[PDB]
Structures are given as structure tokens and as C-alpha cells.
Design an enzyme around this catalytic site. Structure first.
Site, short mmCIF file in Angstrom:
data_model
loop_
_atom_site.label_atom_id
_atom_site.label_comp_id
_atom_site.label_asym_id
_atom_site.label_seq_id
_atom_site.Cartn_x
_atom_site.Cartn_y
_atom_site.Cartn_z
N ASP B 31 34.48 33.50 40.45
CA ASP B 31 33.95 34.16 39.18
C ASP B 31 35.30 34.51 38.25
O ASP B 31 36.09 35.45 38.69
CB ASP B 31 33.44 35.72 39.73
CG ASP B 31 32.97 36.64 38.85
OD1 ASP B 31 33.36 36.24 37.51
OD2 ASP B 31 32.36 37.50 39.06
N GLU B 123 38.67 45.40 46.06
CA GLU B 123 37.24 44.81 45.38
C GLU B 123 35.96 45.54 45.75
O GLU B 123 35.40 44.84 46.63
CB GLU B 123 37.39 43.36 45.07
CG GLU B 123 36.67 42.90 44.07
CD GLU B 123 35.22 43.11 43.92
OE1 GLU B 123 34.71 42.17 44.77
OE2 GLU B 123 34.50 43.94 43.59
N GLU B 132 26.53 47.91 49.38
CA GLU B 132 27.48 47.80 50.68
C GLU B 132 28.20 48.86 51.14
O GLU B 132 28.84 48.86 52.16
CB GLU B 132 28.59 46.51 50.02
CG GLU B 132 27.88 45.15 49.69
CD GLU B 132 28.84 44.20 49.28
OE1 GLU B 132 30.02 43.87 50.26
OE2 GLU B 132 28.62 43.56 48.49
N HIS B 280 29.40 37.54 38.68
CA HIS B 280 28.59 37.05 39.82
C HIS B 280 27.92 38.57 40.24
O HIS B 280 27.17 38.40 41.11
CB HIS B 280 29.16 36.56 40.94
CG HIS B 280 29.70 35.02 40.45
ND1 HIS B 280 30.33 34.46 41.32
CD2 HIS B 280 29.61 34.38 39.39
CE1 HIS B 280 30.68 33.18 40.70
NE2 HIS B 280 30.03 33.20 39.85
#
Ligand SMILES: NCCCN(CCCNc1ncccn1)C[C@H]1O[C@@H](n2cnc3c(N)ncnc32)[C@H](O)[C@@H]1O
Ligand SMILES: NCCCN(CCCNc1ncccn1)C[C@H]1O[C@@H](n2cnc3c(N)ncnc32)[C@H](O)[C@@H]1O
Lengths: 342, 342
Positions: B31, B123, B132, B280
Site C-alpha cells: 500500500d 501502525e 483489531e 488498503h
């Protein structure tokens, strides 16, 4: 229980969560070859179901249990371990079959049945037949089978054949060569290239293909579900000796499977072969990291060993050699994580 | 630890297995908007890294740690809980950076770091920013942050806006209405229709779209990572009041997010907005099971409530109403299992 002993809890949680979705049941129901063949095998062998006692192993939505009821069954015990059981119960009530279908939530290795059954029905086949290890549950269920009772499906055949597919082979290096770059944003990634290659080749490839890629007549490994024990599926050894019909590079082995419903009236086959209409099982190809050159009339001999693991799948070992040259290739695949290439 | 206390083991197993794959690291590294923007933010703020101590939370391949090394960091601790850690160490040795980048295997909630750090990089953004639950790990890492230390990214903005998309609504609804059939191979499925629709409409839709589907200016909810505590993310309440710019059927709410790296030299933004080049992360749409009709100039008011669950994700509740008519829609979405429509 037997199931908990052979299954890591994390795998079972994921597995039954997956089967708890109506979308997944639907996906399998919409496979017309699958569903239609099952219905046909049950209804055309109506004497094996009329006024009989039936066990449905892993009923899911209950579709096979409803087919058994259409064939005249007196009592059907439909065992299901995911939350789909609750959905199945709803269907049983809405189709006015509460007196004929009894849904039993739980694992077939852990539930109780009130009586022994005349026939066991199930759809326990995974990719390459054996994936998901559900056949063992199927075989386990024979503890509830009356003497001389039947099983639908009755037998399973796995087929293996060597193939050539240069583009499939090449795609693996093309993807892995992302890491063969000395300055990805200033970073040299090349030391991981090998690892990348390995990772891609450990994945069996799920898709279909033209039959012209097959280089020899298939070898067959048969499991008779009336006779087999659970332990027979922990280690599956498939020796092979292919007589090459075409010359070329062998890039790996292709797998498919058939099952047979051997009824009193007729035998009905459900086939996932590449010569037959497509099913949602497709076919499975295991690649060789080092392909083997073969001449027409040569013999390609070796072994496919499937070793059951606690992730409800198999570690696959394929060793092959061209006898005329002694050139060898050995390969290890993780059937739990296929590459869905379709 | 904090992580184990908030996470089911089956979910953690699957999660770290997933991030152990080189193919997945590759997907994220490719990405270019994401990777390029991160490198730019770090290199253009070189004074925030030169001779500094850095913690990289969830380093994966190590790419951000390499960026920090490019900006002149003296020491970088790169924490990684998957087997990707091993691969990262390989890269660190092959790029001759063993004296500057130290890979520390394990969860950032469980490992020990030898010293406090000047800056934390990571990230941690998932789909819709919060998927997540990695932001909480990021925030947990602030136990290692020196006073007046920085974080990259520094802040996050989530954007929400109402959209119209008849084709998307219809596609999901058509999938659900399989369970409306009264005679699927002779079986009445229609008692599960309501269940089916619920299931399909609780999956957020991950893809991109033309901005012309948006019916009002977006509302912005900001999380300041320098200031927020882990606990602040267990329950995220986002009230909204949209001024409708176009008349039509509101089929749901669209979500995207921006992050800002607020450095000593400049602020750099990484955007996943539908007006910006695709990443993405795409965008995320939560569909209404029953759309709401709205006129231009109406107000669409309500609340999006995200409740953190033990599957490393959130249960999403969206309640919205058109104030002028009292038309209401309530919806529950399971962010763990999105529908990847691209
Ligand atoms: N015909 C009705 C649906 C049959 N399902 C077929 C899955 C194989 N199909 C397939 N298709 C395409 C690609 C790969 N595989 C499996 C269903 O059996 C259920 N279950 C599995 N183990 C169980 C156990 N030990 N005890 C009780 N229940 C069990 C399972 O939860 C699932 O609902
Ligand atoms: N760029 C560097 C790679 C960073 N990875 C970014 C995830 C982006 N998510 C996303 N989602 C949808 C589309 C695109 N991206 C996440 C990595 O952090 C690792 N990890 C997650 N929790 C951790 C924990 N509590 N302790 C230690 N390690 C942790 C994880 O194992 C993964 O390797």
C-alpha cells in the site's frame, strides 16, 4: 471426549463459529450438484428410509434430515454442534416435523441418543476429502448404528494425478520476488525471498482446471465408511506409480474425490472430478517446489502421506521420483491454509 | 496481562497466526499511500528521531523501525508478537543495523523494555480505525514514554456520513432473501428470513465508492493519542446531527479515517477518505436493514456506539432518525466479520 482430545480449542471455536453463519450453510446448500445428488440418493433409495430410524451427523440447516423425512423416515436425530442447531430447530417447527425430526445440540462425540439408528447420513467431506477431519466424527457415529445398518455416503474415493501447469508454478516466484528488492523504500528485503517462496508452496491450491493438464491416469485411495475406524484416518498413506501418458514438466499432484451412496435400490455417485460439473469443493493441487521432467512411458513413483493434526486438518508430505532418471522431489504442505485461487 | 484479560485466546491465536504470514506483511507494505506517507512523516520530522530512543509497537516486517533508523535514531525497540518477529530480525541483520534496531518478541503488554523512549511509532489502525483493538496496545505503550514524548501517529479523526446506494442494499438483501424461499428442494426456509437479514446486515461493507453517494457533510470524532487512556476505547460514543444536502433514501452510514503525525518540523496527514487516493483500508459502510427517507434540509440525528469485545473488535450500534418525521432505524453490526466487497 474423543473430539476435544484430537482438537485444539482455538481451532474448534473458529470452526463452529464459521458453521454458525447462515451464509455458510447457504453457500453449501446452493451447490446444486451436492444438494441435488444427496436428495436424489435419499429419495430414490426410499426403502432405506421409509419407517426407519436415521441419524444426521452435523445436520447444519437440517436439509438432509428434511430429505430423509421426504423419503418416509419415522424418526431422525439431527446432531449439530454450532449455533446453527437453534436455526435448524426453527425449521423443524415451521415445517411441522417436530414429531419426526429431533434436533440435538452438541458434538456427536459427546451427545446422547435415545435409541440406535437404522442409517447414518452426513455430509462430512472437506477439500481433498479429508480436510476438517469430519469423517472421523462420521465414523465415530457408528457407535449408534444398529448391526447391519447403512451409511450415506457409503464409500469415498480420493483420486490423485500428476499435472503440468507452468503458469501456476511461475506465479509463486512472481509473488515471492516482491522481497527480491535491494531498496524497498531504502530497505533490502532480499534475505526473506526464500522464506516467501516456501510459504507460498506450503499452500494447496483450491480451484478447477482443464483436464488437459493431467499427465497420467489417476490413482485411487478408497475409504469404506461401513468398515473404517477413526484411527484409520490419523495417518493416510497413498503410494502411487503413474505411467506417464504425456511428456513434460510435472509441477505437482492434483486431487479430487467421489463418494458413493450404496442403497438397496441403486448406487448413486457424487463426484468432484474435473471431468464432471463444478462443485464448491473444486479440486486441489499440491505444487512441487522443484518440478520433475518426465517422458511419455516413464513411471513417476512415490508416496502421499497425510498426517492428521490438532487443527482439524492434515500435514501433507509428497515424495515423488521419475524412476528412469532418479530425479526426486519432496514437498510439505499445510492443508489447513489453502490458497483459494478461483 | 492487560492483553490476555481483554482478549479471548482463540481470537488471539487466529490474529497472530494471520500476521505471521509474509504474504500479509507484503500486502500491507505494497500500500504505497500508507508506506510512503509513513516514511515521509518520519523523514521530514528527522529532529524527532535523530539520536532519540524509539519504540515501534507491532513492528511486523520492521519497516517503520528502518524508517526511524533512516532518520538517525540511536536505538529502536521493535516489539512484535507474531512469528514475523523472527523475519524482522533477519532483515535487521541483512541491513547491517544490529547496533540500532532491537527486535523484542512478545506482546507490548507483556515484554520488558530496558529504558524509556522518546517517541512511539506504530501502525495500529484497522478498518474503521478501531478494528483489531490495536490502538489500546498503542496507548498501553505510553507506560514507556518519557515526559513530553511524542507519538506517530499523533491523532486520529473518524469521519461518518450518510449515504445512498440502492444497488448495495439490494445485493445484500437479495443474498438474505435466499431464506425467504418456501420450497427449497421442497423445504420451507422462510421462518429464518428475519434471522438471515439480521446476519447479513450486521457485516460492515469494506470497499470504496464515488463521493456522490454521500448525502451530507461528514461528522468528525477525534481521538488524541498523546492524551487518551486505554480505557477510553472500551466504549466509544459518537453522537451525530447531519444536515441533509440531498433528498433520497439513506441506506446507512459511511466511515473513514485520517491520522496526523504532529512533528516538530511539520504535520503530515495520512487519509483514507473517499476524496483521496485509495488505500488498503478502503472505506467502511454500515447498512440500515430498513432505509430512511430524507429530504434536503432535514436533520438526521443519532448515535454510533462502539462497545469493545473480547474478539479484538467492537459491537457497533447505530441509531438514527429523521427528526422531521420521527422515522427511526436501529442497527447492530459485528465489526469483526466484514464483507469484503472489492
Ligand atoms: N449437510 C449439512 C452441513 C454439513 N457441514 C459440511 C461441511 C463440509 N462441507 C464443505 N463444503 C465446501 C468446502 C469444504 N467443506 C458440516 C456441519 O457439520 C457440523 N459438524 C462438524 N463436525 C460436527 C461434530 N463433530 N459434531 C456435530 N456437528 C458437527 C458442522 O458445525 C457443520 O454445521
Ligand atoms: N506496518 C507495521 C505492521 C503493523 N501491523 C499493522 C496492522 C494494520 N491493520 C490493518 N487492517 C486492515 C487493512 C490494513 N491494515 C500490525 C502488527 O502489529 C502486531 N501486533 C498487534 N498487536 C500486538 C501486540 N499487542 N503486541 C505486539 N505486536 C502486536 C501484529 O502481530 C502485527 O504484525
Amino acid at each position: 471426549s474423543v473430539f476435544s482430545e484430537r482438537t485444539e480449542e482455538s481451532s474448534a471455536v473458529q470452526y463452529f463459529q464459521f458453521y454458525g453463519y447462515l451464509s455458510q450453510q447457504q453457500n453449501m446448500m446452493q451447490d446444486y450438484v451436492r444438494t441435488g445428488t444427496y436428495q436424489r440418493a435419499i429419495l430414490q433409495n426410499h426403502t432405506d428410509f421409509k419407517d426407519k430410524i436415521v441419524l444426521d451427523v452435523g445436520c447444519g440447516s437440517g436439509i438432509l434430515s428434511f430429505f430423509a423425512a421426504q423419503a418416509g423416515a419415522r424418526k431422525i436425530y439431527a446432531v449439530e454442534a454450532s449455533t446453527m442447531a437453534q436455526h435448524a430447530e426453527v425449521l423443524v417447527k415451521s415445517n411441522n416435523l417436530t414429531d419426526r425430526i429431533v434436533v440435538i445440540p452438541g458434538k456427536v462425540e459427546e451427545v446422547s441418543l435415545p435409541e440406535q439408528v437404522d442409517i447414518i447420513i452426513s455430509e462430512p467431506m472437506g477439500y481433498m476429502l479429508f480436510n476438517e477431519r469430519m469423517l472421523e466424527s462420521y465414523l465415530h457415529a457408528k457407535k449408534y448404528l444398529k448391526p447391519s445398518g447403512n451409511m450415506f455416503p457409503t464409500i469415498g474415493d480420493v483420486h490423485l494425478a500428476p499435472f503440468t501447469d507452468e503458469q501456476l508454478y511461475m506465479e509463486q516466484f512472481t509473488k515471492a520476488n516482491f522481497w527480491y528488492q535491494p531498496s524497498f523504500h531504502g530497505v533490502d528485503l532480499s534475505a526473506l525471498r526464500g522464506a516467501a517462496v516456501d510459504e507460498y508452496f506450503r499452500q494447496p491450491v483450491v480451484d478447477t482446471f482443464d483436464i488437459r493438464i493431467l499427465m497420467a491416469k489417476s490413482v485411487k485411495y478408497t475409504v469404506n465408511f461401513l468398515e473404517a475406524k477413526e484411527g484409520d484416518l490419523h495417518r493416510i498413506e497413498i503410494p502411487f506409480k503413474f505411467h506417464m501418458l504425456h511428456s513434460g514438466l510435472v509441477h505437482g499432484l492434483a486431487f479430487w474425490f467421489d463418494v458413493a451412496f450404496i442403497g438397496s435400490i441403486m448406487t448413486v455417485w457424487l463426484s468432484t472430478a474435473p471431468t464432471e460439473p463444478l462443485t464448491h469443493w473444486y479440486q486441489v493441487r499440491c505444487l512441487f517446489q522443484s518440478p520433475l521432467f518426465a517422458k511419455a512411458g516413464d513411471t513417476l513413483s512415490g508416496t502421499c502421506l497425510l498426517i492428521a493434526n490438532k487443527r482439524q486438518s492434515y500435514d501433507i508430505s509428497i515424495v515423488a521420483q521419475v524412476d528412469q532418471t532418479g530425479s526426486k522431489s519432496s514437498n510439505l504442505l499445510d492443508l489447513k491454509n489453502p490458497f483459494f485461487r478461483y
